[PDB]
């Protein structure tokens, strides 16, 4: 079947009726299956709309509105799946049009209801018995209203059952694994499959890429497994499409996900934290002649993770500047910068909200690359702020440029840091001048935590350490991991407390896991299938030769097999 993309422009009219139609034709010319929604709109009168006859199937919704053309020959449209809805919960919508809508082959609507209103020239359609088409679940939302001038039309041939027909002529008058009638009882006798399809055979789901192997308790990849490209199953996704995280092919990757490439097939892995977004710094491109982050441009930094260029925060931002017509920046909006991890240029901070204590907004900043430097000198400059600690706890590298920190009368710590450990370029130097005296900081316990190493701290809390005295639970330094005790039970990997698998029972006066997996803990907390402390036995998971493998419980909570007879589980 020939495939086109579909449309979701709704009631919009793209330019001239000619330009609109010309692009409508371009989309659906010679098209058999519509992957998206079908939208026929603003079609002029006496327009050759006979090309619509090719369309056999629609995945999304069908919208026909604002048309004055006499005929709309959807003569071979067999099925509307209704994977998306136009408005409310309609799969088919015919609104404010049109004389002839001969949908003689429309046998099944898999999901959604139907709407007819304001079609003063429509004929015959009001006689169709929708109960044979729409699933009884969608009946409750049906909205059928046919009304015309007087409604003078042609009459259904007597051949028709109960006088129900789409138009003139006698030509206008199964079950499992199917949804478009049948030419007999089988998988193959279907003009349109139900759930999915693969080489004439209909199915409930495409053969899963991976299958459970009771002969090993491990997961093995079924070579007789295909993806799912819309309603069909494909051995390999078509061109430019990409594999989701549940087997299907799709055009481009999700918003909370990104594209990788295992072997040759391009796949979609979920983003580890906020997906990467590179944005332009100050004094470049979108902001070539901008002086700093102001009230105007700050919003363009939303969702940014990387910055190509520099980042300026000057007094003018908080004052506002009339000459450029830009208000005084609201300091709260600086939180937008919380998602930035990388700065390729330099970071300059000559201003900062007085009521804030540290450079909170950069608590996640990891690297300053200093490819560009202030006065060709500074990669990081923090000057004359009121802040008490810097708070760059995620900062792990300043690869080039000099670091200048001065005039912050209240700034403690800072000198506690070994900046060499961050530097990567030779000759990088640090000027830490005219801040809060060390002895003054001692006087008020403004001192690195006992749980910090001697490498210093970005602040007073234990999460502010450079490195940890003993070990680290996430971002925090701690005395010891939850070995034996503790609510979340843990094991140590590289001086770093790691959480035991959830489905592992704690233990009295003894450890409760050895590794990150379920096959690495003494006693299960729920069930047990082989080495794997599972939370619930596998009951229904497919395996080799397509056989639903079931498993039962036990008094000892061990997952035992069920007799091959049981097809629903013991």
């Amino acid at each position, epitope marked *: 079947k020939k495939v086109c993309q579909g449309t979701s422009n709704k009631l919009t009219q793209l330019g001239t009726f000619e330009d609109h139609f010309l692009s409508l034709q371009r989309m659906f010319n010679n098209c058999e299956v519509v992957l998206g929604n079908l939208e026929i709109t603003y079609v002029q009168r006496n327009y050759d709309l006979s090309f619509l006859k090719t369309i056999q199937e629609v995945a999304g919704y069908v919208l026909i509105a604002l048309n004055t053309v006499e005929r709309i020959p959807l003569e071979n449209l067999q099925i509307i799946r209704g994977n998306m809805y136009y408005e409310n919960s309609y799969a088919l919508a015919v609104l404010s049009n049109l004389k002839e809508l001969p949908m003689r082959n429309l046998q099944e609507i898999l999901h959604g209801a139907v709407r007819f209103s304001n079609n003063p020239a429509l004929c015959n359609v009001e006689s169709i018995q929708w109960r044979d088409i729409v699933s009884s679940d969608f009946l409750s939302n049906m909205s059928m209203d046919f009304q015309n001038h007087l409604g003078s039309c042609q009459k259904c041939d007597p051949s028709c059952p109960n006088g129900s027909c789409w138009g003139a002529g006698e030509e206008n008058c199964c079950h499992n694994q199917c949804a478009a009638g049948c030419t007999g009882p089988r998988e193959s006798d279907c003009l349109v499959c139900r759930k999915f399809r693969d080489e004439a055979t209909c199915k409930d789901t495409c053969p899963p890429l991976m299958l459970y192997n009771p002969t090993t308790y491990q997961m093995d990849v079924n070579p007789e497994g295909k993806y799912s490209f819309g309603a069909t199953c494909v051995k390999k996704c078509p061109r430019n499409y990409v594999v989701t995280d549940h087997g299907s092919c799709v055009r481009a990757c999700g918003a909370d996900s990104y594209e990788m490439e295992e072997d040759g097939v391009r796949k979609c892995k979920k983003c580890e934290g906020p997906c990467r977004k590179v944005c332009n710094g100050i004094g470049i491109g979108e902001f070539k002649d901008s002086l700093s982050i102001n009230a105007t441009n700050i919003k363009h930094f939303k969702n940014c993770t990387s910055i190509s260029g520099d980042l300026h925060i*000057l*007094p*003018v931002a908080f*004052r506002g500047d009339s000459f450029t017509h830009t208000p005084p920046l609201d300091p709260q909006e600086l939180d937008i910068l919380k998602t930035v991890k990388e700065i390729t240029g330099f970071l300059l901070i*000559q*201003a900062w909200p007085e009521n804030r204590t540290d450079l909170h907004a950069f608590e996640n900043l990891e690297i300053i690359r200093g490819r560009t430097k202030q*006065h060709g*000198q*500074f990669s990081l*400059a923090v*000057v*004359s702020l009121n802040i008490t600690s810097l708070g760059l706890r995620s900062l792990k590298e300043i690869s080039d440029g000099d670091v*200048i920190i*001065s*005039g*912050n*009368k209240n700034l403690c710590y800072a000198n506690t840091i070994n900046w060499k450990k961050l530097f990567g370029t030779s000759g990088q130097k640090t*000027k830490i*001048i*005219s*801040n*809060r*005296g*060390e*002895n*003054s900081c001692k006087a008020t316990g403004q001192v690195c935590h006992a749980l910090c190493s001697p490498e210093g701290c970005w602040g007073p809390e234990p999460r502010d350490c450079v490195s940890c005295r003993n070990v680290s639970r996430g971002r925090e330094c701690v005395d010891k991991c939850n070995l034996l005790e503790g609510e979340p039970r843990e094991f140590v990997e590289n001086s770093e407390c790691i959480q035991c698998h959830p489905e592992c029972l704690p233990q009295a006066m003894n450890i409760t896991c050895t590794g990150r997996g379920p096959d690495n803990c003494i006693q299960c907390a729920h069930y047990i299938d082989g080495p794997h402390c599972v939370k619930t036995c596998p009951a229904g998971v497919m395996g080799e030769n397509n056989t639903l493998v079931w498993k039962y419980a036990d008094a000892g909570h061990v997952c035992h097999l069920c007799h091959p007879n049981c097809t629903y589980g013991c």
Partner: antibody
Amino acid sequence: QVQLKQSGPGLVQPSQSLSITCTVSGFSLTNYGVHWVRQSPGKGLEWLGVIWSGGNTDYNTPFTSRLSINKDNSKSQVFFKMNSLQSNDTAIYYCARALTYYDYEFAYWGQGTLVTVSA
Amino acid sequence: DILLTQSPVILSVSPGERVSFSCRASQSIGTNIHWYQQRTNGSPRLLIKYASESISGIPSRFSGSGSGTDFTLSINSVESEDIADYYCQQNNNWPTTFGAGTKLELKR
């Protein structure tokens, strides 16, 4: 040549205010801050405050509530202004610029303004 | 706060002699120290920055050393014109502060 030149009367009556104008040449007030120092014949050299390139200002705590530094980048000048003076404020008042950015090694000084406090 | 003790208060010296000015800081401040010369009816003159870095235009005979708390301004062989007050300046704790100075008198 980097030059700071000062102008302002030095005689101030008690309870009144002192005003000095550091006219700058050789650098921009956009790139360097201009510091204000005084030198008592008895309490030695005292840093009073700064007006940074950004227009933000920092004052030494004994002067926060009675000191005002503003500037005009275009006219290339800085305006110092300390209110309600007293006998102990008798001193030479300097303006200075640091050799390097953001720093405090003062390589360039104004000529000084001898301030006499008396009725 | 931090105190900069300069010694001696006065320092009478014949030309050719060696001269060392002391500036001791109550707290250890690495090498965040600066040195100044102030000549009669003159505005102070930066001699040394960060304890040892030489400022252009200054005679080579001037030099600086020391760190932590004990700092020393030195002169190879004093010359008549070296008559001045000499100040040290800390750069570590807010705000910058200066020492009470040491006066260099000359014998002839």
